[PDB]
Ligand SMILES: CO[C@@H](C(=O)NCC[C@H](c1ccccc1)c1ccco1)[C@H](O)[C@@H](O)[C@H](O)/C=C/C(C)(C)C
């Protein structure tokens with residue numbers, strides 16, 4: 001394998017962490033290949049659930065608990081902290097909230113969150129690498145509570161970063177927020193990628209094509225598919241009651257991705273940095289409710 005930049009995996013990984021059996025588990029957690037039979041049963045449908053009142057309450061809850069766990073992780077980002085140490089803290093914080101860490105064993109993903117540094121686009125596997133001053137790191141949290149999943153991410157700065165890092169992270173966050181600002185009933189899912197790409201391209205960045213936002217509720221990934229690039233052909237129209245994520249990955253160089261031999265870590269083919277933000281959104285009559293927003297602070301963590 002020829003690595004595309006300076007990052008390398010730092011092995012061995014810690015043995016898989018158990019979740020006590022009093023915590024409710026999603027279907028894939030005990031499938032040997034981590035397959036979700038409830039998702040597979042819906043693979044080839046473009047149909048989108050209209051959430052009931054009960055479902056919306058269940059989503060509001062799990063998404064606020066997910067935000068609290070991302071905030072725990074944010075508090076730990078400093079030079080010399082390993083991404084495994086962040087994942088251990090995340091795993092305990094989900095269990096403290098009587099939630100299961102949705103990524104764990106999802107298609108046999110081996111950890112409880114994703115930690116993506118620098119050229120990693122997404123799905124990085126927490127490992128023994130200490131964070132370095134100058135890194136950008138994304139921590140991606142998903143919790144499962146009472147049958148519902150809540151999913152969010154932010155990119156963070158590890159100590160002092162260069163100007164390129166600052167601009168890429170800021171632009172990525174703005175891409176996400178301008179797409180959220182367009183969400184309301186009657187808008188096509190395919191429109192968000194036009195917005196995101198327009199703003200990324202204005203800043204000299206590119207938009208990853210291989211990974212998309214998605215419906216989420218009782219299933220971790222379901223309809224709609226929500227691409228982040230322009231002129232995509234996604235199917236569907238937003239209605240009050242739809243819940244889904246927007247999670248753009250924007251890159252300093254070209255958009256092309258590849259995956260590491262671990263079968264998870266997605267990286268820029270050119271080795272240049274990539275940043276991402278994600279929120280879980282519910283469409284309301286007035287636009288949308290950001291289920292995974294901060295309730296106690298105006299800005300994302302990188303802007304402190
Ligand atoms: C970019 O990452 C997302 C993803 O893989 N989005 C792809 C979604 C997918 C998809 C499928 C085919 C092509 C492109 C996207 C989809 C949409 C609707 C149904 O399935 C995940 O949703 C991410 O936010 C989550 O935190 C990490 C999850 C793992 C446990 C998997 C690491």
Ligand SMILES: [Mn+2]
Nearest residue numbers: 140151152153
């Ligand atoms: Mn996520």
Ligand SMILES: [Mn+2]
Nearest residue numbers: 151245247278
């Ligand atoms: Mn997601």
Ligand code: NA
Nearest residue numbers: 117118120274
């Ligand atoms: Na990255």
